[PDB]
């Protein structure tokens, strides 16, 4: 598998992630901002979406924290909450894996 499913729609990402554990996620091309990515993340009761923005140096960010690559952004949010309303960490393996 892969984190990255560029062609998945927002609703398709919701459907896929409803079948996954909290913190599982997919990175897709944004429908609203076509040259950018969106990260969809399974929360406890639903799936929420984050826009991956770019600064004038080409860094990637969600909030204020900047990263030179999507990979570094993902790895940061394994340890730090991606959500400001709840504590949610990105995950991509089950506990049994």
């Amino acid at each position: 598998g892969s984190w990255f499913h560029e062609g998945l729609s927002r609703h398709q990402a919701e459907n896929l992630l409803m079948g996954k554990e909290v913190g599982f996620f997919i990175i897709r091309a944004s429908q609203s901002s076509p040259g950018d990515f969106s990260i969809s993340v399974r929360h406890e009761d639903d799936v929420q979406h984050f826009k991956v923005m770019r600064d004038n140096k080409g860094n990637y960010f969600l909030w204020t924290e900047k990263f030179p690559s999507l990979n570094k952004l993902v790895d940061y949010y394994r340890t730090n909450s991606i959500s400001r309303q709840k504590q949610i960490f990105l995950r991509d393996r089950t506990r049994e894996d």
Binding site: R10, S32, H49, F50, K51, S83, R84, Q85
Partner: peptide, 8 residues
């Protein structure tokens, strides 16, 4: 649509 980190 709606994104959690959309701010002005």
């Amino acid at each position: 649509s709606d994104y959690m980190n959309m701010t002005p």
